[PDB]
Write a protein that binds this ligand. Structure first.
Ligand SMILES: *[C@@H]1O[C@H](CO)[C@@H](O[C@@H]2O[C@H](CO)[C@@H](O)[C@H](O)[C@H]2NC(C)=O)[C@H](O)[C@H]1NC(C)=O
Ligand SMILES: *[C@@H]1O[C@H](CO)[C@@H](O[C@@H]2O[C@H](CO)[C@@H](O)[C@H](O)[C@H]2NC(C)=O)[C@H](O)[C@H]1NC(C)=O
Ligand SMILES: *[C@@H]1O[C@H](CO)[C@@H](O[C@@H]2O[C@H](CO)[C@@H](O)[C@H](O)[C@H]2NC(C)=O)[C@H](O)[C@H]1NC(C)=O
Ligand SMILES: *[C@@H]1O[C@H](CO)[C@@H](O[C@@H]2O[C@H](CO)[C@@H](O)[C@H](O)[C@H]2NC(C)=O)[C@H](O)[C@H]1NC(C)=O
Ligand SMILES: *[C@@H]1O[C@H](CO)[C@@H](O[C@@H]2O[C@H](CO)[C@@H](O)[C@H](O)[C@H]2NC(C)=O)[C@H](O)[C@H]1NC(C)=O
Ligand SMILES: *[C@@H]1O[C@H](CO)[C@@H](O)[C@H](O)[C@H]1NC(C)=O
Ligand SMILES: *[C@@H]1O[C@H](CO)[C@@H](O)[C@H](O)[C@H]1NC(C)=O
Ligand SMILES: *[C@@H]1O[C@H](CO)[C@@H](O)[C@H](O)[C@H]1NC(C)=O
Ligand SMILES: *[C@@H]1O[C@H](CO)[C@@H](O)[C@H](O)[C@H]1NC(C)=O
Ligand SMILES: *[C@@H]1O[C@H](CO)[C@@H](O)[C@H](O)[C@H]1NC(C)=O
Ligand SMILES: *[C@@H]1O[C@H](CO)[C@@H](O)[C@H](O)[C@H]1NC(C)=O
Ligand SMILES: *[C@@H]1O[C@H](CO)[C@@H](O)[C@H](O)[C@H]1NC(C)=O
Ligand SMILES: *[C@@H]1O[C@H](CO)[C@@H](O)[C@H](O)[C@H]1NC(C)=O
Ligand SMILES: *[C@@H]1O[C@H](CO)[C@@H](O)[C@H](O)[C@H]1NC(C)=O
Ligand SMILES: *[C@@H]1O[C@H](CO)[C@@H](O)[C@H](O)[C@H]1NC(C)=O
Ligand SMILES: *[C@@H]1O[C@H](CO)[C@@H](O)[C@H](O)[C@H]1NC(C)=O
Ligand SMILES: *[C@@H]1O[C@H](CO)[C@@H](O)[C@H](O)[C@H]1NC(C)=O
Lengths: 419, 433, 212, 149
C-alpha cells in the first residue's frame, strides 16, 4: 500500500509560536514544453504518390485533402508563435559588462560561454545533451534557430542581473546586484539588513545550489521526461502514419502499382477506392490527434510565457507559482522544444519555540506590534520580525495603541520603553 | 491564385504545389530468356486426365504469349481472378502451374475459388484466394466415346472433404452404411468412384468438357515465366520511368552500397514500397531511389503592391533543382526559376528570384531557419537574416544606480475574442433534404 | 536422451533486403529454450516423425553424417525424398526404393538434382508442396550439446516436389552425434542490421517480458 | 488590422460554413452530386447503391465540421476565461502581476465591447528621464549602520 507521507502532530496551543532562527537559499528546476516539431503532409503524394489514375479518383472527394493541408499549416505556424511569446519578451539584446563583479554571486555556469560553437551557457549545453519518409510527409525548420533562442535567454539573463524588475517595466536601470537582492528580500517580508549582514553566506548558498544542478542534470536525465515526450510522441505519430501505407483496408494489395499493373481500370478503380478511403481515414486520424496535441502544447507555451513575465521579469507573490518557499528570483535557460526556469527561493530553516501574546498592557493602554510579533524567552518580552528571529526591545517606535486592556483576549502585562 | 481560389493574393508565403524531378525515359528489364513455354502440350494433350486423378504441370524458364490462348475462339470460358487477362503479356512470374482434366458441363460451374458441389468438395479444390485463370471448353466431339466412357470419374463421400490443390489416388470402399464394409459391397457399402456416361447424344450439361487451370506463382523470388515484352538498356543517376520483372514505377535508378545477401532480390521501406532491386540482366544491385521532391512555397508581396515573385524549393539543394522552363513538367516552370541571376541556398531549401542582402531587419515574411524576406528598393524581394533587436550594454557598476526623474502615463489596447457564431444544423436536411 | 535448444534455429523469412529495422513475422520456428532429442553413431538411428517441420543438427569429427531420407513411410511403395552429400556433390532424388535401407551408405524417381569439433545445423520445412532447406556450419568448443548463443541459418535450396512428408531418417557413410527438434507457429521480432542480416530475434510467446 | 483577432474569428466560421456547403457538390464515387438525379435516373435496388456513397461522404464531411468546431470552441473558451480573469483583476482591481494588464506598472483598465470579443484600455505608469547616481547599501554614523526605511 502506498504511503502518503510521514505523520506530524503540529505543537499547537493558544500561546505558543515557532519563529525560524536561520534560512537556506534553494535553487530548483522547472521544465516546460513550448513548441513541438513543425510538419506538413502533401496529402495527394501520401494517399496516391505519382499515380494519375489514383489522383482522378481522389478528386471525387472534393476539398477533404486541401482542408487537411490547411489544418497542418495552422498547427505549424503557431509553433513559431509559441516560441515568440515565450522568448521575445525583451525589446533589446542586453549584454553583460566585461567584469563579473556581482557581489559574490557567480552566474558563470548560466551566462553564455564564448568557447561553445553556439554561445550557450554551460547548463544550456547539458540540457541540449539530455534530450535526444519520402511519402509526402515533411518536417519544417523553426523560424528562430537555437542560436537565436540562446541570444534571447542571454539578454533576459543579462538584463535581470544588471537591472532587476526595471527592464520589464521601462528602460533597464542599472543597480548593484547585492542591493537588488536586498530589495528582493524586502519583498518576502525579511528586513533588508538580513542580507547585508549575511551576504557571504547567502552568496555561498546560491553558488553551491547552482553547483548541485550541474550534478543533477549530469546524473538524473529522467527530469527532462516532459521535453523527451514531445520528441517521442511526434516520432511515434509519424511512424504510425507511415506504417499505415502497408495496410490493405480490404484491397488486393497494400501497393498501388500491384493493383494498376495486374488489373484494367473497371476492376482497378474498385480496389484503389478501398486504399483511398483507408489512407484518407488514416491521415484524418493523424491530423485530428495533432490538433488536440497542439492545444496541449499551446496551453504550456502560455504558461511558460506567464512564468517569463511574472518570475524572470519580476518577483512573484503567488504561492508555489515559482518554486516552493518565498520567491526571490528566476533565470531562464533554453532546452530542445522547451524552456527551463531555475527558481531561486528563500526557505526558513531552524525553528525555535516561544511563548507569545497578541497585545501588551502598559499604563492600562493595549499595545500592538507595528511590524512583527511579540515573543518571550520565559523572562523577558521582545518584538521580532515574523520570518527571521531578530528580537528587539518593545518601544513606542515598534508598537501602536488601541483602547484599554479589557477588550483583548490573551493580552499580557509588560512595560513599553519610551525613547 | 489557383491554390487560394482567388485572383487577389495578399502578402505572404503559400504552399502551392510539390515539385518532383520527372521520368526522362522508360526503362524495361527482364530475365535472359527466349525459349517458348510448352502451351501446345498443355492445351492440346491427346486425352485429358480423369478429374479424380487430375494432371498438374509446372511451367518455368520460358517465354509465354497468352494472346495465343486469349484471342483463340476455341474456349467456352477464360475467367480470371486477381489478374485482368490483358495484363498477362506485361506481368511475369516465378513459375506457372497448369492443372488439367475432363469434367461434365454442369460441373464447370464448380471450378472457381470458394465454389460448392460434389467435385469441388471431394476431388478438385481451388483455394478461396486463388490468383489466376480457369479455361474450359466443350469436348463432346472428342471425349464422348459412344456412351460407356466411365474412365472419367469423381467423388461424392468416402471419408472427408478435399484441401486446395490436394492430390488423391486412394481406393478404400465407401462406408455410407453402419457396417464395417471391409472391401465388400452391400446396402450403402459401395465402390469409391462415381463415373460419367459420355454419349455424344448427351444434353449439353451432361456432355464432357476439357479444362485447364493456370495458377501463377507471384512470389518474391526471381521470375522464370514472362510475356513477349522487350527490355531496354539500363540508365543511372537520372530520373526515369521503370519496369523490372513487372514491378513498375518512377525513380532515379543508381548503383547501391547496400550489401544484399545472395538470395535477396529486392529491398523494401517501412511503407512496404520498394527502394532497391537486383538487375535481372546485369545482376548488379541498384537503388530505385525516389526522384527528388519538395513543397513549392511561393513568396509574394501583396498583388496590391507588385506581381513580382520568389520561390522556395523546400529541402532541395540549389545544385540539384533542374526545372528552368516548362520543358520540365508544370508547377513553377516559368523560364527563369532554377538558374537565374539571383539564387540562394537557405537551410530551409533553395530560394530563387529573391535577392540576398548582407544587412539585417525586423522579420517581414518569414522563410525559416533565421531567414526572412521583404519587398524593397528598382524594387526586389530581398532576403536577409532577421534582427532580434537593438544591442545594449547596460552601464552596470557595483556602486552606480539610475533613477527615473519623470514618468509617462501610457494607454495600451488589448483585444480578446470571447464568443463565436452559434450555428445549428439539421443533419437529415444536410445529408438527404 | 534430451538437451535444450536455447536461442538456436533462427532462419531468414523472406528474400527481401531490410536495413536497420525491427520487423515482426509469424512462421514455423523452433521455440526458444525448448528441448531436442539426442543420438550418436551406434547400432540411436530409427525412423522419426517429421511433424510440421524439422530442426536437425550434428557434432562431428570429420562429417560422418552424409544425408537423410524423408517421406510418408520410406517403404519402396511411394516417392520418398533423398538428400545425400557423396563427397563430389550434394545429390537429391525422390525414389521409392530402399536401395540403401539402413541409416548409412555402404561404401520411377520423378525428380532429381545435383550440385565432435565441427557443428552443422539444418532446417527442413514443407509449404504447399514446396520443401525448403536452410543450414549453418561452424567449429565449436562445446563437446556435445547445442551452443548457448545466437546465430542465423541461411537458405540452400527449394524443391517443388509436392511430397506428403510425415516421416524421416538420417544417413551416415561407412565401409559423430546428432539431435532433432520440431518447428512450431510463432510470432518473432527480428533485428535486421545495416547489412541486410538478421542479427537477433525475440520469441514473443515465450514469457511476459517477451510479450512486452 | 489592429482587430485581426476578432476579424479572424469571423473569417474562420465563414470559411468553415462555406467549406461544409461546397462538399454538397462532390460525387464521393456516386454517379452524380445531385440526389434527385440518382432518384430520377435509377430504380430502387440500383439507386440505393449510389445514395449510400453520398450518405457515407456527406456524414464524414459533417463529422469533420463538428469535430473542428469542438476543438475551435475550446480555443475560444480558453480566451473567454482569460478575458473574464482580466475583467476581475485589471478592471475591478489593480494588478501586481507583471505584464498582465499591459507593459509598465498597472494603474487602471477600462473595457470596451467589440464584435465577438472585448477590448481593454490598460493604463500604466512607465518611468522616464533616467539620471545616474553613486549609491551604497548603508550609512555609518557614530559607528552604527543605518539602512533606509
Ligand atoms: C545558518 O545555517 C548555515 C548553514 O546553512 C550555517 O553556516 C555554516 O556554519 C558553520 C560554522 O557554524 C561553517 O563551518 C559552515 O561552513 C557554514 N556553512 C556554509 C554553507 O557557509 C550558519 O552558521 C547558521 N547560522 C545559525 C545562527 O544557525
Ligand atoms: C565562478 O565559479 C567557477 C566554477 O563554477 C570558478 O571556476 C574556476 O575558475 C578558475 C579561474 O578563475 C580556475 O582555475 C578553476 O579551475 C575553475 N574551476 C572549475 C571547477 O572549473 C570561477 O573561478 C568563479 N569565478 C569567480 C570570479 O569567483
Ligand atoms: C531572556 O533575554 C534576556 C535579554 O537578552 C536575557 O538576560 C540577559 O542575560 C545575559 C547573560 O545571559 C546578561 O549578561 C544580561 O545582563 C541579561 N540582561 C537582562 C536585561 O537581564 C535572559 O537571560 C534571557 N532568559 C532566558 C531564560 O533565556
Ligand atoms: C495586569 O496588571 C493589572 C494591575 O496593573 C492587574 O489588575 C489588577 O488585578 C487584581 C487581581 O485580579 C485586582 O484586584 C485589581 O483591582 C486589578 N487592578 C486594576 C487597576 O485593574 C491585572 O489583573 C494584570 N493582568 C495579568 C494577566 O496579570
Ligand atoms: C496426405 O496424407 C493424408 C493422410 O495422412 C491424406 O488424408 C486423406 O485425404 C482425403 C481427401 O483427399 C480425406 O477424404 C481423408 O479423410 C484423409 N484421411 C485422413 C486419415 O485424414 C491426404 O490425402 C494426403 N495428401 C496428399 C496430397 O497425398
Ligand atoms: C516545541 O515545543 C513542543 C513542546 O511539547 C515540542 O513537542 C516540539 O518538539 C518543540 N519544537 C522545537 C522545534 O523545539
Ligand atoms: C489557553 O489554554 C489554557 C488551558 O490549556 C487556559 O487556561 C488559558 O486560559 C488559555 N489562554 C487564554 C489566552 O485564555
Ligand atoms: C492447339 O491446336 C490448335 C490447332 O488444332 C492450334 O491452333 C493452337 O495454337 C494449339 N494451342 C496452343 C496453345 O498453341
Ligand atoms: C544477358 O544477355 C546480355 C545480352 O542480351 C548479355 O550481354 C549478358 O551477359 C547476359 N547476362 C546474364 C546475367 O546472363
Ligand atoms: C493597396 O491598394 C490600395 C488602393 O487599392 C492602396 O491605397 C494601398 O496603399 C495599397 N496597399 C499596399 C500595402 O500596397
Ligand atoms: C548542396 O550540394 C553540393 C554538392 O552538389 C554540396 O557541396 C553542398 O554542401 C550542398 N549544400 C547543402 C546546404 O547541403
Ligand atoms: C557580403 O558579406 C561577405 C562576407 O560575409 C562578402 O564576401 C560579400 O562581398 C558581401 N557582399 C556585399 C554586397 O556586401
Ligand atoms: C527437457 O527435458 C526434461 C526431461 O529430461 C524435462 O523435465 C524438461 O521439462 C524439458 N524442458 C523443456 C523446456 O522442454
Ligand atoms: C511410380 O510410383 C507410384 C507410387 O507412389 C505408383 O503409383 C506408380 O504407378 C509408379 N509408376 C510406374 C510407372 O510404375
Ligand atoms: C556423386 O554423384 C554423381 C551423380 O549424382 C556422380 O557423378 C559422382 O561420381 C558421385 N561421386 C561418388 C564419389 O560416388
Ligand atoms: C557492413 O558492411 C560494410 C561493407 O559494406 C562493412 O564495412 C561493415 O564492417 C559491415 N558491418 C557488419 C556489422 O557487418
Ligand atoms: C551613466 O554613467 C555612465 C558613466 O560611464 C555612462 O556610461 C552611462 O551611459 C550613463 N547613463 C545615463 C542614463 O546617463
Amino acid at each position: 500500500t502506498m504511503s502518503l507521507g510521514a505523520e506530524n502532530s503540529v505543537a499547537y496551543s493558544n500561546n505558543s509560536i515557532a519563529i525560524p532562527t536561520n534560512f537556506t537559499i534553494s535553487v530548483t528546476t522547472e521544465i516546460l514544453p513550448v513548441s513541438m516539431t513543425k510538419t506538413s503532409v502533401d496529402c495527394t503524394m501520401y494517399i496516391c504518390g505519382d499515380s494519375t489514375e489514383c489522383s482522378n479518383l481522389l478528386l471525387q472527394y472534393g476539398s477533404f485533402c486541401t482542408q487537411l493541408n490547411r489544418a497542418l499549416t495552422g498547427i505549424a505556424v503557431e509553433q513559431d508563435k509559441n516560441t515568440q511569446e515565450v522568448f521575445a519578451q525583451v525589446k533589446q539584446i542586453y549584454k553583460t559588462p566585461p567584469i563579473k563583479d556581482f557581489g559574490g554571486f557567480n552566474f558563470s555556469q548560466i551566462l553564455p560561454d564564448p568557447s561553445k560553437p553556439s554561445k550557450r551557457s554551460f547548463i544550456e549545453d547539458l540540457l541540449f545533451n539530455k534530450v535526444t519518409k519520402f511519402n509526402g510527409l515533411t518536417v519544417l525548420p523553426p523560424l528562430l534557430t537555437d542560436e537565436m533562442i540562446a541570444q534571447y535567454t542571454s539578454a533576459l539573463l543579462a538584463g535581470t542581473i544588471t537591472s532587476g524588475w526595471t527592464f520589464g517595466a521601462g528602460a533597464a536601470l542599472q543597480i548593484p546586484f547585492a542591493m537588488q537582492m536586498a530589495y528582493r528580500f524586502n519583498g518576502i517580508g525579511v528586513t533588508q539588513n538580513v542580507l547585508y549582514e549575511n551576504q557571504k553566506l547567502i552568496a555561498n548558498q546560491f553558488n553551491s545550489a547552482i553547483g548541485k544542478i550541474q550534478d543533477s542534470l549530469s546524473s538524473t536525465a529522467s527530469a527532462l521526461g516532459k521535453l523527451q515526450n514531445v520528441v517521442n510522441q511526434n516520432a511515434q505519430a509519424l511512424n504510425t502514419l507511415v506504417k499505415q501505407l502497408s495496410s490493405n483496408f480490404g484491397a488486393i494489395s497494400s501497393v498501388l502499382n500491384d493493383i494498376l499493373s495486374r488489373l484494367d481500370k473497371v476492376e482497378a478503380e474498385v480496389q484503389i477506392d478501398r486504399l483511398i478511403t483507408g489512407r484518407l481515414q488514416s491521415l484524418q486520424t493523424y491530423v485530428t490527434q495533432q490538433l488536440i496535441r497542439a492545444a496541449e502544447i499551446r496551453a504550456s507555451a502560455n504558461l511558460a510565457a506567464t512564468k517569463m513575465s511574472e518570475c524572470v521579469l519580476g518577483q512573484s507573490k503567488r504561492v508555489d507559482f515559482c518554486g516552493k518557499g518565498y520567491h526571490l528570483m528566476s533565470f531562464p535557460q533554453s532546452a530542445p522544444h522547451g524552456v527551463v526556469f531555475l527558481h531561486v527561493t528563500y526557505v526558513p530553516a531552524q525553528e525555535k519555540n516561544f511563548t507569545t501574546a497578541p497585545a501588551i498592557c502598559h499604563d492600562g493602554k493595549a499595545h500592538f506590534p507595528r511590524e512583527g510579533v511579540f515573543v518571550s524567552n520565559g523572562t523577558h518580552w521582545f518584538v521580532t520580525q515574523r520570518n527571521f528571529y531578530e528580537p528587539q526591545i518593545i518601544t513606542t517606535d515598534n508598537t501602536f495603541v488601541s483602547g484599554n486592556c479589557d477588550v483583548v483576549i490573551g493580552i499580557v502585562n509588560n512595560t513599553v520603553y519610551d525613547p | 491564385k489557383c491554390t487560394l481560389k482567388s485572383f487577389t493574393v495578399e502578402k505572404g508565403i503559400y504552399q502551392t504545389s510539390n515539385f518532383r524531378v520527372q521520368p526522362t525515359e522508360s526503362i524495361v528489364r527482364f530475365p535472359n530468356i527466349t525459349n517458348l513455354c510448352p502451351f501446345g502440350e498443355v492445351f492440346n494433350a491427346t486425352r485429358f486426365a480423369s478429374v479424380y486423378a487430375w494432371n498438374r504441370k509446372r511451367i518455368s524458364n520460358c517465354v509465354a504469349d497468352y494472346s495465343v490462348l486469349y484471342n483463340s475462339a476455341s474456349f467456352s470460358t477464360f475467367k480470371c481472378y486477381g489478374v485482368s487477362p490483358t495484363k498477362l503479356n506485361d506481368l511475369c512470374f516465378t513459375n506457372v502451374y497448369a492443372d488439367s482434366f475432363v469434367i461434365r458441363g454442369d460441373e464447370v460451374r464448380q471450378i472457381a475459388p470458394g465454389q460448392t458441389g460434389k467435385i469441388a468438395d471431394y476431388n478438385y479444390k481451388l483455394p478461396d484466394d486463388f490468383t489466376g485463370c480457369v479455361i474450359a471448353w466443350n469436348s463432346n466431339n472428342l471425349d464422348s466415346k459412344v456412351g460407356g466412357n466411365y474412365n472419367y470419374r469423381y467423388r461424392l463421400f468416402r471419408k472427408s472433404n478435399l484441401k486446395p490443390f490436394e492430390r488423391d489416388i486412394s481406393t478404400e470402399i465407401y462406408q455410407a452404411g453402419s457396417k464395417p464394409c471391409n472391401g465388400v459391397e452391400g446396402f450403402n457399402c459401395y465402390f469409391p468412384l462415381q463415373s460419367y456416361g459420355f454419349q455424344p447424344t448427351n444434353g449439353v450439361g451432361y456432355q464432357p468438357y476439357r479444362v485447364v487451370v493456370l495458377s501463377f506463382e507471384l512470389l518474391h523470388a526471381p521470375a522464370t515465366v514472362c510475356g513477349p515484352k522487350k527490355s531496354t538498356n539500363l540508365v543511372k543517376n537520372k530520373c526515369v520511368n521503370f519496369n523490372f520483372n513487372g514491378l513498375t514505377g518512377t525513380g532515379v535508378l543508381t548503383e547501391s552500397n547496400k550489401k544484399f545477401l545472395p538470395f535477396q532480390q529486392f529491398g523494401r521501406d517501412i511503407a512496404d514500397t520498394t527502394d532497391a532491386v537486383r538487375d535481372p540482366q546485369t545482376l548488379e544491385i541498384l537503388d530505385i531511389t525516389p526522384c527528388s521532391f519538395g513543397g513549392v512555397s511561393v513568396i509574394t508581396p501583396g498583388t496590391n503592391t507588385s506581381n513580382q515573385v520568389a520561390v522556395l524549393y523546400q529541402g532541395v539543394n540549389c545544385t540539384e533543382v533542374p526545372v528552368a522552363i516548362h520543358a520540365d513538367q508544370l508547377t513553377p516552370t516559368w523560364r527563369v526559376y532554377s538558374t537565374g541571376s539571383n539564387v540562394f541556398q537557405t537551410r530551409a531549401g533553395c530560394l530563387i528570384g529573391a535577392e540576398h542582402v548582407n544587412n539585417s531587419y525586423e522579420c517581414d515574411i518569414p522563410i525559416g531557419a533565421g531567414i526572412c524576406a521583404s519587398y524593397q528598393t528598382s524594387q526586389s524581394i530581398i532576403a536577409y537574416t532577421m534582427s532580434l533587436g537593438a544591442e545594449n550594454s547596460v552601464a552596470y557598476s557595483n556602486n552606480s544606480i539610475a533613477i527615473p526623474t519623470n514618468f509617462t502615463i501610457s494607454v495600451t489596447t488589448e483585444i480578446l475574442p470571447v464568443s463565436m457564431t452559434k450555428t445549428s444544423v439539421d443533419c437529415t436536411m444536410y445529408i438527404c433534404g | 536422451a534430451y538437451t535444450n535448444s536455447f536461442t538456436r534455429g533462427v532462419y531468414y523469412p523472406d528474400k527481401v533486403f531490410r536495413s536497420s529495422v525491427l520487423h515482426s513475422t509469424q512462421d514455423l520456428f523452433l521455440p526458444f529454450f525448448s528441448n531436442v532429442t539426442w543420438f550418436h553413431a551406434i547400432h540411436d538411428n530409427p525412423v522419426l516423425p517429421f511433424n510440421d517441420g524439422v530442426y536437425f543438427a550434428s557434432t562431428e569429427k570429420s562429417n560422418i553424417i552424409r544425408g537423410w531420407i524423408f517421406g510418408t513411410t520410406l517403404d519402396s511403395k511411394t516417392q520418398s525424398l533423398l538428400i545425400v552429400n557423396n563427397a563430389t556433390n550434394v545429390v537429391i532424388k525422390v525414389c521409392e526404393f530402399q536401395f540403401c535401407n539402413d541409416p548409412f551408405l555402404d561404401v520411377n524417381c520423378t525428380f532429381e538434382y545435383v550440385s565432435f569439433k565441427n557443428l552443422r545445423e539444418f532446417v527442413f520445412k514443407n509449404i504447399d508442396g514446396y520443401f525448403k532447406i536452410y543450414s549453418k556450419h561452424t567449429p565449436i568448443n562445446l563437446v556435445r550439446d547445442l551452443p548457448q548463443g545466437f546465430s542465423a541459418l541461411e537458405p540452400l535450396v527449394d524443391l517443388p516436389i509436392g511430397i506428403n512428408i510425415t516421416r524421416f531418417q538420417t544417413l551416415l557413410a561407412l565401409h559423430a552425434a546428432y539431435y532433432v527438434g520440431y518447428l512450431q507457429p510463432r510470432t518473432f521480432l527480428l533485428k535486421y542490421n545495416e547489412n541486410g542480416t538478421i542479427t537477433d530475434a525475440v520469441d514473443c510467446a515465450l514469457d511476459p517480458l517477451s510479450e512486452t
